[PDB]
Design an enzyme around this catalytic site. Sequence first.
Site, PDB file in Angstrom:
ATOM      1  N   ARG A   7      -6.903  -5.938   1.885  1.00 39.76           N
ATOM      2  CA  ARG A   7      -6.986  -4.939   2.946  1.00 39.76           C
ATOM      3  C   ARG A   7      -8.410  -4.587   3.397  1.00 39.76           C
ATOM      4  O   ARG A   7      -9.231  -4.102   2.626  1.00 39.76           O
ATOM      5  CB  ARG A   7      -6.255  -3.661   2.533  1.00 39.76           C
ATOM      6  CG  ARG A   7      -6.570  -2.486   3.449  1.00 39.76           C
ATOM      7  CD  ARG A   7      -5.910  -1.197   3.060  1.00 39.76           C
ATOM      8  NE  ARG A   7      -6.291  -0.120   3.971  1.00 39.76           N
ATOM      9  CZ  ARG A   7      -5.684   0.147   5.126  1.00 39.76           C
ATOM     10  NH1 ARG A   7      -4.631  -0.557   5.532  1.00 39.76           N
ATOM     11  NH2 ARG A   7      -6.117   1.153   5.873  1.00 39.76           N
ATOM     12  N   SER A  44      -1.287  -0.495   4.684  1.00 42.24           N
ATOM     13  CA  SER A  44      -1.052  -1.915   4.942  1.00 42.24           C
ATOM     14  C   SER A  44      -2.015  -2.845   4.236  1.00 42.24           C
ATOM     15  O   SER A  44      -3.173  -2.515   4.014  1.00 42.24           O
ATOM     16  CB  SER A  44      -1.096  -2.197   6.442  1.00 42.24           C
ATOM     17  OG  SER A  44      -0.332  -1.200   7.111  1.00 42.24           O
ATOM     18  N   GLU A  93       2.244  -9.717  11.820  1.00 39.74           N
ATOM     19  CA  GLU A  93       1.263  -9.187  10.874  1.00 39.74           C
ATOM     20  C   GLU A  93       1.486  -9.646   9.428  1.00 39.74           C
ATOM     21  O   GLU A  93       0.574  -9.538   8.619  1.00 39.74           O
ATOM     22  CB  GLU A  93       1.248  -7.654  10.916  1.00 39.74           C
ATOM     23  CG  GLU A  93       0.694  -7.066  12.205  1.00 39.74           C
ATOM     24  CD  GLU A  93       0.706  -5.544  12.237  1.00 39.74           C
ATOM     25  OE1 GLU A  93       1.075  -4.902  11.224  1.00 39.74           O
ATOM     26  OE2 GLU A  93       0.335  -4.983  13.294  1.00 39.74           O
ATOM     27  N   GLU A  95       3.056  -8.272   6.984  1.00 41.38           N
ATOM     28  CA  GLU A  95       2.489  -7.104   6.321  1.00 41.38           C
ATOM     29  C   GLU A  95       3.212  -6.794   5.024  1.00 41.38           C
ATOM     30  O   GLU A  95       4.430  -6.948   4.925  1.00 41.38           O
ATOM     31  CB  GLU A  95       2.550  -5.885   7.249  1.00 41.38           C
ATOM     32  CG  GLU A  95       2.172  -4.585   6.570  1.00 41.38           C
ATOM     33  CD  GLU A  95       2.273  -3.384   7.489  1.00 41.38           C
ATOM     34  OE1 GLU A  95       2.191  -3.541   8.729  1.00 41.38           O
ATOM     35  OE2 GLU A  95       2.425  -2.269   6.955  1.00 41.38           O
TER      36      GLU A  95
END
Lengths: 208, 103, 103, 103, 103, 103
Positions: A7, A44, A93, A95
């Site tokens: 991240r 995230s 994404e 994610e």
Amino acid sequence: NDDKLYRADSRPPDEIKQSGGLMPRMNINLYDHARVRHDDGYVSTSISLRSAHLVGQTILSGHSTYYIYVIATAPNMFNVNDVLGAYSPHPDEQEVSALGGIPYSQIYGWYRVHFGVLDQLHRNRGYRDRYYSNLDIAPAADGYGLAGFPPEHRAWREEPWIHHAPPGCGTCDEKTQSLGVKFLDEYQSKVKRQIFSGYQSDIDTHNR
Amino acid sequence: TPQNITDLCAEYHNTQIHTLNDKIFSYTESLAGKREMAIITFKNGATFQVEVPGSQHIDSQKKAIERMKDTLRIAYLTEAKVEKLCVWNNKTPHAIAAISMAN
Amino acid sequence: TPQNITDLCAEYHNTQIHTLNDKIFSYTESLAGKREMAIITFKNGATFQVEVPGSQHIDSQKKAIERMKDTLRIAYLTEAKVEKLCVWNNKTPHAIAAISMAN
Amino acid sequence: TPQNITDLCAEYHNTQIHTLNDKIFSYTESLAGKREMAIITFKNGATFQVEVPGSQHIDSQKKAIERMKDTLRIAYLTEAKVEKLCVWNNKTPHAIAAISMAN
Amino acid sequence: TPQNITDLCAEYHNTQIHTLNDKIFSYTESLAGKREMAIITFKNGATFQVEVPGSQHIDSQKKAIERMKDTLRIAYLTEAKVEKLCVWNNKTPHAIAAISMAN
Amino acid sequence: TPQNITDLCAEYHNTQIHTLNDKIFSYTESLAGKREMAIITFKNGATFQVEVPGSQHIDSQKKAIERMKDTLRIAYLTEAKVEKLCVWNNKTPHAIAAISMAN
Ligand code: NA
């Protein structure tokens, strides 16, 4: 297993220490969170270094210095696309989101990014390898019920969320909130057992 | 001097190695008169004691008994993986003489 | 009075510094009679003991032996990086005299 | 020798088992003269003490009483689930004789 | 009674306050005879010791010396920010009399 | 026997409850002769001590004074919420007689 996630975050290591980890912007709602992403109770992460770096290139292009934190997998994490399914709003994404954020001990290390150039990995002393390597992401079936769609959304009347629909869904938002609060309370409690038990493995009854 | 728990165990009568490679499932501890002991279980149902101190232990073993209870209490809480236990099998439950933790 | 483990080690006979820069791979502890010791290993194969308290020890060392075994357990369970060990090398396994931790 | 806390409890007069399967809600301790004791509660309002050492205790329990208070503080801070307590029910609050922890 | 480390420190001759506002860089401890001590360092190179117990110490200090070593170990291991040390400056390395931790 | 800290404190004439419901802001300890004590503070400026063991304490308090300092140090490092302190208010800083911790 020992999988790692990544991240980009402008918050420096000293702040991460002081905060007890990477924290969200408390409302906890995955759907709302998904619409660097840290709102509505989740933080995230990306499944690769190069991914997180790119996210930071476009979102934190503006900070002379930011960081890419390397994070272990654990059951505070949800594969967003698996939990939200077809209704995942930004599924490119790839994610994985941490419900209530990422505790400091789950952070393996961090890279410094200066003016767009990634350094040179710094290992976190707070990290616990054997603990986190014996852990994985939460299965999506733990998340279906925390998906956090509005009471009216078609998901709650569709599989698989139909069978995990919180009361009032399909106070729905009330229940989504309290189920997330409960999950986070139970999760944090396991992590404090682990770190604070370690902190008390010095005790020696006989010597006094 | 033994270099590992297995060699250590082999020096004594009435011992055996149990290989668990698992964390402790339960930790129990008592201050009741004459039952000042601890008891651990593993998830396969195996049960072990750290004995009430007595005349079967020499003075040097007395502090080591106290250290074993500290260790088992915190191993339990820390979910540390217990590799092996060396135990006396002339007791029920089997009584711990040595432990090793590894992953 | 020495300012680091290397200078401290050099004050004694039959010692040497082992530089590990690694966390402890296994921790073993025994309360069996005359084997009231601890043994640690590192993933590179190296094994070390904290000795059974004996007549090679002066009384001031007794509490410090106990502290050292305390230190090795929390180091093990917190995965603390061991920087160096000072050890007596006329013993098998080599016997710990001092530990340093950094990084 | 007993294999679990329940059988242990059954060995004494004036004891009973409480099954809580919950973490400790509060830990209190005191160094006030004649009240050198610990008190714990659970969210359900259940309240337990570790007794001030006294004439009801034999010498071997003194060390165990000290370990029990530590055990409670440690369990409180790690939020560890207490499965059962064995207590003397002829005291108010009920006085802890033994604890089991299982995840 | 003094309400802080600075005022406590000023009650003694040959002491001064060091201000680190930083976690301990390294923790070293020895069980070697006559060197039963601990040494810590900070990343600026500043080095401090808890002295070997000796003639300069009164009885009430023996347990506090042992407690300080416990404190420096856990501080180091938890990365706890050390605010200030009170030290004796007539010793090398400077000998710790007191510590404060705060963020 | 009291069921809580408030009730415990009211058995003493020279005591008072402070309600903090907050973590410890700083922890200080000293091994300096005649100042073998701890001092804690809170965000709001409130300051408390654990007194040096002295003639005002009975034997049963001595072990408990040592446990209290153990408790405060770990409470500080874990950031545990301190609910209430029972203190003697005829000392400055007020002197800790008991502590409760609750979420
Ligand atoms: Na993992």
